Structures are given as structure tokens and as C-alpha cells.
Design an enzyme around this catalytic site. Structure first.
Site, short mmCIF file in Angstrom:
data_model
loop_
_atom_site.label_atom_id
_atom_site.label_comp_id
_atom_site.label_asym_id
_atom_site.label_seq_id
_atom_site.Cartn_x
_atom_site.Cartn_y
_atom_site.Cartn_z
N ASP A 199 3.49 5.70 -11.28
CA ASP A 199 2.71 6.87 -10.94
C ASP A 199 1.87 7.23 -12.24
O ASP A 199 1.95 7.11 -13.29
CB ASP A 199 3.77 7.91 -11.17
CG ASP A 199 4.73 7.78 -9.72
OD1 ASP A 199 4.36 7.24 -8.81
OD2 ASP A 199 5.97 8.03 -10.07
N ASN A 201 0.63 7.74 -7.12
CA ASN A 201 1.45 6.56 -6.79
C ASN A 201 0.39 5.25 -6.60
O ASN A 201 -0.41 5.40 -5.63
CB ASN A 201 2.40 6.81 -5.93
CG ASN A 201 3.31 5.31 -5.83
OD1 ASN A 201 3.31 4.64 -4.90
ND2 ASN A 201 4.27 5.26 -6.75
N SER A 229 6.05 -0.04 -8.18
CA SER A 229 4.53 0.74 -8.27
C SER A 229 4.76 1.64 -9.59
O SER A 229 5.76 1.93 -10.27
CB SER A 229 4.65 1.67 -7.18
OG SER A 229 5.54 2.65 -6.99
C1 LIG Z 1 1.57 11.99 -5.33
C2 LIG Z 1 1.89 10.84 -4.68
O1 LIG Z 1 1.51 9.67 -4.97
N1 LIG Z 1 3.09 10.63 -3.91
C3 LIG Z 1 3.54 9.64 -3.30
C4 LIG Z 1 3.63 9.58 -1.81
O2 LIG Z 1 2.24 9.77 -1.24
C5 LIG Z 1 4.46 8.60 -0.94
O3 LIG Z 1 4.48 8.99 0.41
C6 LIG Z 1 4.25 8.26 1.48
O4 LIG Z 1 2.76 8.43 1.53
C7 LIG Z 1 2.22 7.83 2.51
C8 LIG Z 1 0.57 8.02 2.73
O5 LIG Z 1 0.61 9.59 2.96
C9 LIG Z 1 2.83 8.19 4.00
O6 LIG Z 1 2.33 7.52 5.09
C10 LIG Z 1 1.74 8.37 6.02
O7 LIG Z 1 2.96 8.91 6.53
C11 LIG Z 1 2.49 9.97 7.67
C12 LIG Z 1 3.65 10.70 8.26
O8 LIG Z 1 4.17 11.66 7.17
C13 LIG Z 1 1.64 8.75 8.89
O9 LIG Z 1 1.29 9.93 9.98
C14 LIG Z 1 0.69 8.33 8.11
O10 LIG Z 1 -0.10 7.52 9.21
C15 LIG Z 1 1.20 7.38 7.00
N2 LIG Z 1 -0.17 6.71 6.54
C16 LIG Z 1 0.16 5.41 6.14
C17 LIG Z 1 -1.20 4.93 5.39
O11 LIG Z 1 1.29 4.71 6.15
C18 LIG Z 1 4.35 7.93 3.81
O12 LIG Z 1 5.16 8.47 5.06
C19 LIG Z 1 5.05 8.37 2.56
N3 LIG Z 1 6.22 7.84 2.64
C20 LIG Z 1 7.28 8.76 2.38
C21 LIG Z 1 8.53 8.29 2.30
O13 LIG Z 1 7.21 10.08 2.06
C22 LIG Z 1 5.85 8.40 -1.77
C23 LIG Z 1 6.64 7.35 -1.20
O14 LIG Z 1 5.94 5.97 -1.37
O15 LIG Z 1 5.64 8.23 -3.06
C24 LIG Z 1 5.00 9.31 -3.84
O16 LIG Z 1 4.75 9.09 -5.15
#
Ligand SMILES: CC(=O)N[C@@H]1[C@@H](O)[C@H](O[C@@H]2O[C@H](CO)[C@@H](O[C@@H]3O[C@H](CO)[C@@H](O)[C@H](O)[C@H]3NC(C)=O)[C@H](O)[C@H]2NC(C)=O)[C@@H](CO)O[C@H]1O
Ligand SMILES: [Cl-]
Ligand code: NA
Length: 129
Positions: free
Chosen positions: A52, A59, A50
Site C-alpha cells: 500500500d 494497493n 502487494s
Molecule cells: C485503497 C485500496 O487500494 N484499496 C484496495 C481495494 O481496492 C481492494 O479491493 C478490490 O478492488 C477491486 C477493484 O475495485 C475489486 O474488483 C472489482 O469488484 C467489483 C465489485 O465490487 C466488480 O464489479 C469490478 O468489475 C471489479 N474490478 C476488477 C478489475 O476486478 C475487488 O472486488 C476488491 N476486492 C475486495 C475483497 O474488496 C482490496 C482487496 O485487494 O485491497 C485494498 O487495499
């Protein structure tokens, strides 16, 4: 476009980021500084394939479509190129969705490691808002 500190603060405030979901303006300016150094055209590739994009380094695996991140969600429903504009509206709108769930601003690694728990208010010092 490379924004000036107070210039960015003013644009973010105008776009309603000051205290959005409890996060003061200093947090957003601090996040932008360490995520992109205030450069709207910043891009960075990650190991999972991916990328940023923009001032807030949003992301492609989750928020926008760049047509090259296999099996990724496009939660903000926008092509990632829209996040590189000199107009931060698209980035702000998507950031609002991101912070709305998940872990809040912890979604931004630079924020979590360099802004969280620091005097973020200093990032807006001297600005006319
Ligand atoms: C600024 C940026 O792009 N940051 C990126 C982060 O967004 C990303 O984190 C992951 O984001 C997803 C979406 O918010 C998270 O999924 C959610 O998680 C919650 C629990 O916290 C859950 O209740 C939601 O239903 C779920 N949504 C979906 C659609 O699955 C996910 O947990 C995050 N993962 C982590 C490890 O934090 C990170 C990681 O890809 O990248 C950043 O660049
Ligand atoms: Cl929160
Ligand atoms: Na995607």
C-alpha cells in the site's frame, strides 16, 4: 511530507474531493489520517505480496505498478512511487477512480472501520476552506 489537518483538507478540496461521488471532505481527511497519519511517504506490505502506498494507502495489486506484485493490475496507470510525492495530485486522481466503482470508500479498510458512520465533519473543524 507530513500534512497538517487543515492543510490537507484545503489541498483535497482544491483537487475536487469535497463531495466526490457523494463523499464529503471530512471522509477523505479521516481516511488519510488513519490510513497514513497524513504522511505521503507511508508504505505497508500485505500478506499477498502487494504493498500500500502514500497518503491514501493505494494497493499495488490493483492500482499502481511497483514492479514486484506478480500478476497485478495497474488500473491508475502509474508507478506506485508517484503516490509517495509531497504533491497529492497523483493520489487524488487515482482515488477518484477507486471510489468511482467497486464498493466506494469501503475500499479503504481504515475508513470502513474508523470513519464510516462517525461525525466526519469534525475533521474539517476550524479550517479555512
Ligand atoms: C485503497 C485500496 O487500494 N484499496 C484496495 C481495494 O481496492 C481492494 O479491493 C478490490 O478492488 C477491486 C477493484 O475495485 C475489486 O474488483 C472489482 O469488484 C467489483 C465489485 O465490487 C466488480 O464489479 C469490478 O468489475 C471489479 N474490478 C476488477 C478489475 O476486478 C475487488 O472486488 C476488491 N476486492 C475486495 C475483497 O474488496 C482490496 C482487496 O485487494 O485491497 C485494498 O487495499
Ligand atoms: Cl458509494
Ligand atoms: Na499492480
Amino acid at each position: 511530507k507530513v500534512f497538517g489537518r487543515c492543510e490537507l483538507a484545503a489541498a483535497m478540496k482544491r483537487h475536487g474531493l469535497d463531495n466526490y461521488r457523494g463523499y464529503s471532505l471530512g471522509n477523505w481527511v479521516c481516511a488519510a489520517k488513519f490510513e497514513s497519519n497524513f504522511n505521503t511517504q507511508a508504505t505497508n506490505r500485505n500478506t499477498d505480496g502487494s504493498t500500500d502506498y502514500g497518503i491514501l494507502q493505494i494497493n499495488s495489486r490493483w492500482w499502481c505498478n511497483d514492479g514486484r506484485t506478480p500478476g497485478s493490475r495497474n488500473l491508475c496507470n502509474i508507478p506506485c512511487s508517484a503516490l509517495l510525492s509531497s504533491d497529492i495530485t497523483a493520489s487524488v486522481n487515482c482515488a477518484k477512480k477507486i471510489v468511482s466503482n467497486g464498493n466506494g470508500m469501503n475500499a479503504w479498510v481504515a475508513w470502513r472501520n474508523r470513519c464510516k458512520g462517525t461525525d466526519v465533519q469534525a475533521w474539517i473543524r476550524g479550517c479555512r476552506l
